[PDB]
């Protein structure tokens, strides 16, 4: 019961990264702040809460996730494993190193569950708005409760923004758009594979969308995939029905052609080509504009905003590290919420950040760019009770996926790694990747094979 | 004037404000400053067609509804403008059912010729719209995308004319997490093309769903299915079109009805409707209402009745389109320049009440035009606005309605008589079903 009120928007994994910091905090014995957190979906997760839902959801609202069918950790489950929870903890026993989404969902939902910091949250609220009182020193935030159909407001000290930066698609428009056939989309918006059997597929981009998306559709049966790259080739070795070319350069109504002067028929296309970070609750004085990189510029260690302290932003940085990276900035922006941690002049802060900045231009190869998020994360557990993990060994099994995925881009998924909490090395799942066509968890955690 | 006033979107509605105003000072008045806000890259609203689905380039909602291949799904005859004739716009007659493209086209030239451009500032979205007590004032808050700005600006009026088809109702059933199909919502729906040789689940029995269903069946669809909530269209389809009780459940690969029937389906079509949605507005200012001939709190449908500094257009359901709007933009300005006072709050009520009253006895398609025939009526006999002949325009609609009925397939076929000039409208060169381009150079062209 401190005097201070915060507000958290987001209920998705930074979001209860955040509140879990604060009841922490308080199984601690310490006083903390009143927490209320806002979420505009009907239940937690942001991302892991997956919908058929496209375009706008039941309220009007954006849809949120950007999750399909069938999506497996994209990583070892073992680089993203809770050192205050265990995996092993959690299912009571050894599970393969690529969980299906439900899976996870699964084990993130468990932590939380157990901290029991739901009854800070109110669900199927939208933020609307954000501003800062001079006069009060104060956050006004405006939501709209969808339940009650009503829109209210509330003040508050401090604000934490959760609110993610995959979700806002990026999409750009190629000549005869407007002409073609077939269906257009961005992957924000796609769901089942199944709808795109025995079809020809277009993939325009060239990051781990493209390889994803695409992924999904040769295994679910897509009769042929094209991807096109705007600046470089993935250059992974693809399956027969799969060819990668140059960027694509108009349409037509049936036939897209491509810089290297080729052309074919098409039966829909799927642009995998980014998110941007979007705000539309906050004015200027307030609001992060960043492309997706490592170290975006006007936030101190990351999280705080440089022109108004009393406000910060979590998972705003690209994601190599995930969950632990949310954690460690969480519990850093509590102990700079409960007064534990001063903050330096302005001045400081602007140098502290132009730093991070220069080292992060630096940065060449993947080995580099794990290295210094965990650098990163490093500097901020070593400023709390947070503990401290291994992320020297985490990153060498960052490594090994990479290496794994240049091997055989269809089968990384079949690999296994050794857990850094527990030692224990991850059995082979019961099904390969390939022939497991069911995304279940009653399919996952049981025991029997799937027939190819 | 000393006044400013905030228009906020730049499809017809909006546009119509704007000419009402522009309109005011051709004949010598003097107007207030007007700024007009559209989220948009040019005018249009609706018709300014897009293939983009979601969100846009700016992470806005994607606002049109419209697809490929759309027509006019009433006699241009009964949208045609008093004060800007068909004959004037295109030079020659032409059929009575046009195109998009070519609609578009047509009301682009009125605002062309008002030069009214110059007040809207594009690709700009309104985030937000507050009224201050102490300066009775409106400060509205906007995004330029262009510049990737926000900035806000004070007003001493503000009209909403952001429209009410482009936020969808989609209603869930259950299986939708397990269908292996496209499931999507009429308002994005794009090309008819994407589901040629394919099973399409229609699921509602309005426009959309006539519409939606008939461009399926045109391109090529193997078969459609439609259910309906309530009570069935009652058309007569094509023999690969059945009409069936509601969906109940899908699994995998099938949905299975109300009726008992079940039947492998390719992809889901909801067109269920839309909501009033102002994500701009807090509650004092914000509209809610289902989609209806007689929205509450409007007092003479425009007025705010909460707060009267504050107006909105086209709010009502639509059997009338573009002269309502001319009539409702016309009265409005009248009140803002104060040529019409208001009455009392008491009295207002009073009014809405009546109208309300008078909705909830309507039963045939007939009585609901009239309605709407006298709703508009009512409104140009305050204003300069020319009276046109509403109750000729009411039969041309009854005509319509008529030849719905006799072939769902063809209605589109028939010619009708100008109300502005008395011509009849010319049978197109070529024949609907068989029209398969939608260009408006194709249109006007004869081939
Ligand atoms: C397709 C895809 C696959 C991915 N796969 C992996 C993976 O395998 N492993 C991994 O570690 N990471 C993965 N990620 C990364 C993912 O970003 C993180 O795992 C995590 O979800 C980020 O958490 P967040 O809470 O910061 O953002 P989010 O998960 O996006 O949560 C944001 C929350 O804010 C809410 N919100 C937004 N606006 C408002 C508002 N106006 N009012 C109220 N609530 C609002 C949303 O509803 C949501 O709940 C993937 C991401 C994508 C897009
Ligand atoms: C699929 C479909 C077919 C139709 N067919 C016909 C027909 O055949 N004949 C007929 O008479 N009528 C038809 N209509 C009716 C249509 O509503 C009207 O013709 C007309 O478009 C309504 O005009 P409006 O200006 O009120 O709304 P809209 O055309 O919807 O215009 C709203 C405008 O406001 C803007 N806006 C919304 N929010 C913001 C924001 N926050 N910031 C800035 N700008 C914003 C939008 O970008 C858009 O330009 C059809 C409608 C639909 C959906
Ligand atoms: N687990 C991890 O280690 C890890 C690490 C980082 C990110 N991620 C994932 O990154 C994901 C977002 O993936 P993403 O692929 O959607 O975003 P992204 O990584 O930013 O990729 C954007 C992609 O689209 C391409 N593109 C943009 N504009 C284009 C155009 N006009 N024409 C052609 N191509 C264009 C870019 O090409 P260019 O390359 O030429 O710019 C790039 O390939 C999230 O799921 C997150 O999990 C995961
Ligand atoms: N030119 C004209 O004369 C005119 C006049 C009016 C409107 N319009 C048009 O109205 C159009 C809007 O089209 P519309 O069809 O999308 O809006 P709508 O007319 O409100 O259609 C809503 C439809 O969805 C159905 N529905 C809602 N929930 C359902 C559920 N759970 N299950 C099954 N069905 C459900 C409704 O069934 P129920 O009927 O049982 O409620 C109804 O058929 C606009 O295009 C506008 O032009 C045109």
């Not at 205050?84 to 959690?90: A, I, M, V």
């Not at 739901?118 to 009060?136: L, M, P, W």
């Not at 059997?197 to 994803?212: H, N, Q």
């Amino acid at each position: 019961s401190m005097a201070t009120r915060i507000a958290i928007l987001g209920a998705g994994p930074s979001g209860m990264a955040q509140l879990r910091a604060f009841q922490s905090a308080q199984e601690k014995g310490a006083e903390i702040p009143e927490l209320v957190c806002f979420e505009k979906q009907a239940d937690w997760g942001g991302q892991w809460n997956y919908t058929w839902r496209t375009g706008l959801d039941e309220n009007g609202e954006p849809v949120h996730s950007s999750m399909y069918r069938y999506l497996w950790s994209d990583g070892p489950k073992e680089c993203l494993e809770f050192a205050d929870y265990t995996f092993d903890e959690h299912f009571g026993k050894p599970i393969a190193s690529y969980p299906p989404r439900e899976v996870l969902w699964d084990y993130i939902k468990g932590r939380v569950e157990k901290a029991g910091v739901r009854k800070y949250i109110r669900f199927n609220t939208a933020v609307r708005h954000v501003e800062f009182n001079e006069d009060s020193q104060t956050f006004t935030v405006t939501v709209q409760d969808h339940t009650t159909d009503t829109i209210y407001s509330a003040a508050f000290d401090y604000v934490v923004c959760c609110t993610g930066h995959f979700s806002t698609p990026y999409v750009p428009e190629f000549e005869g758009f407007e002409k073609f056939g077939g269906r257009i989309l961005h992957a924000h918006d796609f769901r089942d594979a199944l709808e795109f059997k025995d079809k020809t597929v277009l993939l325009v981009g060239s990051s781990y969308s493209a390889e994803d998306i695409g992924s999904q559709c040769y295994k679910y049966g897509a009769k042929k995939l094209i991807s096109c790259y705007r600046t470089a080739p993935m250059g992974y070795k693809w399956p027969e029905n799969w060819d990668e070319r140059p960027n694509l350069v108009r349409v037509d109504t049936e036939n897209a052609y491509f810089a290297d002067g080729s052309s074919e028929k098409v039966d829909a296309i799927i642009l995998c080509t980014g998110y941007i970070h979007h705000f539309p609750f906050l004015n200027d004085d307030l609001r992060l504009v960043t492309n997706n990189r490592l170290w975006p510029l006007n936030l101190y260690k990351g999280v705080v905003w440089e022109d108004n302290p009393k406000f910060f932003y979590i998972g705003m940085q690209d994601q190599w590290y995930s969950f632990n990276m949310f954690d460690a900035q969480a519990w850093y922006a509590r102990d700079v919420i409960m007064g534990r941690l001063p903050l330096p002049s302005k001045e400081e802060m602007k140098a502290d950040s132009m730093a991070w900045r220069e080292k992060e231009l630096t940065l060449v190869t993947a080995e580099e760019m794990y290295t210094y998020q965990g650098d990163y994360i490093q500097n901020l557990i070593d400023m709390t009770d947070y503990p401290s993990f291994d992320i020297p060994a985490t990153n060498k099994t960052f490594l090994e996926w990479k290496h794994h995925k240049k091997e055989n881009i269809m089968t990384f998924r079949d690999h296994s790694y050794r857990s850094l909490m527990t030692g224990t090395m991850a059995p082979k799942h019961h099904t390969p990747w390939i022939d497991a066509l069911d995304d279940s968890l009653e399919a996952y955690l049981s025991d029997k094979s799937e027939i190819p």
